[model samples]
Target chain A: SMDDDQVAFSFILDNIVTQKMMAVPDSWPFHHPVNKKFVPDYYKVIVNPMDLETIRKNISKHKYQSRESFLDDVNLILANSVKYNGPESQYTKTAQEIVNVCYQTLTEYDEHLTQLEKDICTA
Target chain B: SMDDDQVAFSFILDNIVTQKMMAVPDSWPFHHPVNKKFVPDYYKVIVNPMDLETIRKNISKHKYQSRESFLDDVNLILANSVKYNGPESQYTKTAQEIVNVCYQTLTEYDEHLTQLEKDICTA
Candidate 1:
């Protein structure tokens, strides 16, 4: 069951994830002076702009087919962050934090989504 | 007759004038070496704080009884700028510029008010 509050949360979460994922440059770098550590190869690549745009449009429209549908959409965006994690990928870390907050806030407000398999099977 | 555009203009004008008026310091001074001109007494005094506050409250509430009423309220505020003008009172100059702009914008938008006597007599 999805309500406006749930929809709003998904909308914001979707935007946060998409923004963070798209901010990753082609060749991201991280450096530490004290430990003399430099890991520039950590971020090999970023998500496709088209993919990010699709999620953005979805969020802007507040088009959540269902709770599972919204989470799956958000998960797709989060996967990009995971793929682009680097030694100092603050973007990825921040996106992860936002996703946790979104989930916590949603559940805290008693808005629960069914398991994806069950949701999809019923749908 | 006053519309929202006129009211909004007066609101902004009133705010600008009051802000500039209050910003004048007690011991304000101005000096230029190239011109060898020093006139610290140019801004001998500022207007009473109560007067400025009255105009500010009027503007905030958009309480213009008529076009003349609004202009009269705004004029009281502009007088402070004229009274506080100094050799380097950029605040006064800026306040004056805002009043000019406010009048120009109101007239440009075809919002005209009668003379104070005409307005008061009709009221």
Candidate 2:
């Protein structure tokens, strides 16, 4: 039904978003390779803005923690980040929104996120 | 303002799609890893339905091409697949769909994709 030329052009445009996303670096904590080791569908991260704040605070207040130690702290906080349906488990809808907000903030602010990266370039 | 449990639970759901996508193997040509080398964004592969046709046709004709040789051919067709914006280029909108149709077809149908290993399980 369609001509040859038309089909080719759209293919590139449709996929360019991915190409653009790949242009950014995934260095340090964000190191991901492109060659044979790429996921076709799902490659994403849920960042915690508070974690960054916590890191910053620890740095300023001289609450020194090694990277391994900091990750261990994250291990502790994951429970709080997760739902606790108990008597003391104050699990409500708003409680959930806060987590989402933190994740959104982290994804938006984190240099490792392409969506955030593009947002920054445009902003 | 929602409850805490609600926020945490929703995040789990938001990420479930990704978790599922990751469950699919990225084997053979689709070998991408998860550990430290992961990009938070910018991943996706467009399938070329036309290319599949070409590949299948070649296969049926006993026109065997090594994986390396096949990719080499791909390098050539990319030109037609890409818009010339030049003169002999009768570039129109639908012309583009042919490419994306082919690419989409490839990503979706490529068995070795996700290594094409799992489709047999549910199918």
Candidate 3:
């Protein structure tokens, strides 16, 4: 809600969190899009498969023209992983761990943006 | 972010969801606080015991000076319940069920509030 009227600047914030999430060493499982051709069974389990690469591509291509869409896709990556994997699997746990990191990064950036707007000068 | 400068309107929206959550018949388990006097074991297991009545009292008392506090207390009612109960308990599941209802209610109201703001016209 801070400046940029909530759209273009959302892109920057979304990408920032994307970088942080991608850099996490445990993110390998979700780093690339699932190979639908190699295992179509995955598609049977989850209608929509999302990954870090797909999210980054959309970010670059402006596919997520709004914050809600970007948030949905990022959350879907986790949702699909948790949906397909066993409840006790480490893969499920890894995606679960990154969720807070993703949301926290975005909120931290928004805090910074709000502060930046607050310091606006009349000079 | 829609009008009312966020705080006062946030209180109204917060209370609106409270009403929705409270009215839910299955919400009985969390409608009242834990009896620390009756069972100190609960306190040993969970330091916090939040309930709908406590949340309602706070809403009336302006105890949640901000959205974050109100959200925390409301969610804490779930967290404390889940914490004290076993992972497989229905209490745990019930608390979990209401979490989405809580958030969905808030967002839906925010959507309405945003629409309300958009309809403003110049005199």
Candidate 4:
């Protein structure tokens, strides 16, 4: 058991190993034939941390940004919505609703951030 | 090129580092003083991998498990649904519906496992 523990420790030591964790071969789950299998008209969705971070950064960066900021971000993505084709439209609608809610919440906090800034300015 | 490869390999030598990952945090998109707030009488969803694994195990366990089995598990959790007081009643109906769908698909494949078993014997 101690040897097992030692082996585990040694194995985890910062030696080195390389792996192609992802081939990133310009393909994902939908690219597989056995998976999607002749589904021609389909929806594609990209949920990336960078994209989300960019949205968050923009929202927080602006001093005068209103609930409209949220709406603008959502509408940019949702303006492409179509009916009955796939879940993408539904997702867009939901995303817009979430953005609107976020906008409302942010508007409420606008007073607070303003006061905090005024305090900092006075100090 | 060879040096870069070795360097990259060295950087990934171990997995001992502790970091946080989640299905998404409870505070995420809902945290901040006056920056965000919430409304009452709303849905609160909890997602966990362990829960999913248990569900998968329970669902895949019985040959006779059927969709009813999946449903039984869901219904057990959902049957407490009520008129929005928040003890878990509205969930039962949708949960039952999901279980029914699962049952329908599993019922169709009840023969597939057998055919494979038979083919293995012949081969």
Candidate 5:
């Protein structure tokens, strides 16, 4: 019952991560945390970083308490870019595109959840 | 007349850089660019980076077109730290303190500039 939305949202999140974000050829940098050793000051400068795989694991583990929390993690990746990568970077641009696709897809499904709720609520 | 404000502001900017930002022992990191070799991803991440010394030079060079532009560059260093370092980082906290002092000092002098302008103007 409650698992229904959990399972569906996870499925949708996975599709966005896989089909939309990771589908690009050069999307590797955002796939994981900015390599700490490779990027020394990254940890020093960027506070709490995010990446695609981490979101994937968050989905797998059901760590997201709500879609709002889920969206924050997803958005953190883009925010990290502007911090560590500058607004005009190729990397930041990639992040923007990825997040755009992600937000748009999530919003559409969020609408479906609202519509689906219409059918089930009685009280 | 224009030179009076420009010279006074430049003097103020220089003071903020020297006495406030650089006075602290071990305040070396924010004095210049994040090292390109040591921080390979820094420039890549922080598009148009700023630091204390750069602001000093801008003051000397008269590159700042307005007080607002001068403030923006001063603010950028702190913003870059948040982007690269994360909001909770020790570095970001240092930046916050540094910017706070700089902003407060500048605000006081800005008030002076407003008062000074009142004395000289008729139109």
Candidate 6:
């Protein structure tokens, strides 16, 4: 199960690179209540490599025992942000890409778990 | 103002043509809690000419006292649906267009109100 944590690390890294770093909106007024709360900081993270690295370190500490728990959190944030910002906003594409990654990650994690279980049983 | 109600009628028609009929999502599963509630019927209305006309007739009956009241309703629906479908869904474009219409309608309605006030003052 030590490798499971590593799997979780790579999954989170993949998500940050493909999803979080790219999807946050940078538009002015950041008018939506949800965006209003998070965008100022989120925009800073997207534009600055150092901020993203900080997030990377923070996210790495979380070892998601199940994919659903991780995904629910991701979807909730992405959906609410998109809802408030208007789907046409530049950030909308990022939200969409993140959702795709969410689905892909769920499947990949499930497969990894199955293989891991099979290997442990055979051993 | 007798003409104020007529202004309301045109504003609603403009909104229907540019927003509502065009914005409703048609994709399957319609997974968002909001979309799931309304899509089957909404899809039917979007596809059928008679259904759209029916909406047109019904909408004309609403005499908006002010622009804000009309807009709050439009934004609430568009934002929620877009949030659930993922901003990339086929329906996302429709939602975006509707929001644009909402903003434009608000501006137009405000302008009408200003003109109506000016005319009343002069009379």
For candidate 4, lDDT tens digit of each residue in B1-123?
233332222222111000111122221221111111353323332211112234433423322212333333332222222112232223323432332333333344456534443443353
Show the colliding residue pairs in model 4: B67-B103, B80-B88, B80-B89, B81-B88, B81-B89, B81-B90, B82-B89
* DockQ of all predictions against the true structure, Cα-based: 0.01, 0.01, 0.03, 0.02, 0.05, 0.10
Runs off by more than 4 Å, candidate 3:
A1-11, A36-40, A111-123, B1-123
Query: Which window of 10 residues has the lowest lDDT sum in candidate 4 chain B?
Result: B13-22
| Ranking of predictions according to DockQ | 6, 5, 3, 4, 2, 1
- Model 6 lDDT tens row, B1-123: 356545555565556544643454552222132342645565443321222333344346543344444444444444545444453444554544444444544444566655544553463
**Displacement of the residue A90 alpha carbon in candidate 1, Å:** 2.0
Q: Highest DockQ, which number? A: 6
lDDT of candidate 2 over B4-119, digit per residue (tens): 33333223322321333223332111112212234233123212222333543453443332222333232223222222222123331222222223333333444443322233
Question: Which regions of candidate 2 are displaced past 4 Å?
Answer: A1-123, B1-57, B62-75, B81-88, B92-95, B110-123
lDDT of 5 by residue, A13-102 (tens): 678789987876578999987888889899887667889999999888767645656666766776677677875578866775676566
lDDT of 5 at B14: 78
Q: What does candidate 3's lDDT look like per residue over B9-100, in tens digits?
A: 44674566567776665778677887668666887787767887777767665455344566677657655653466333466546544554
Real contacts retained, model 5: 0.08
Window of ten residues with lowest summed lDDT in model 3 chain B: B114-123
Q: Whose lDDT is higher: candidate 2's or candidate 3's?
A: 3
DockQ, prediction 2: 0.01
After TM-score superposition, what is the CA distance of residue B117 in candidate 2 from its true location, in Å? 8.8
DockQ of 6: 0.10
Q: Judging by DockQ, tell me the better candidate of 2 and 4.
A: 4
TM-score of each: 0.26, 0.22, 0.43, 0.22, 0.47, 0.34
Per-residue alpha-carbon lDDT of candidate 1 for residues A1-123, written as tens digits (9 for 90 to 100): 355554555555464545444443431221111111343443345333214456556666656645555555544343444344421245444433333333443443443333332443453
Scored by lDDT, model 4 comes in at 0.29
Q: Flag regions of model 6 displaced more than 4 Å.
A: A1-123, B1-58, B105-110, B116-123
What lDDT score belongs to each candidate, Candidate 1 first? Answer: 0.42, 0.28, 0.60, 0.29, 0.70, 0.45
Candidate 5 residue B119 Cα shift, in angstroms, is: 52
Fraction of true contacts kept, per model? 0.00, 0.00, 0.00, 0.00, 0.08, 0.20
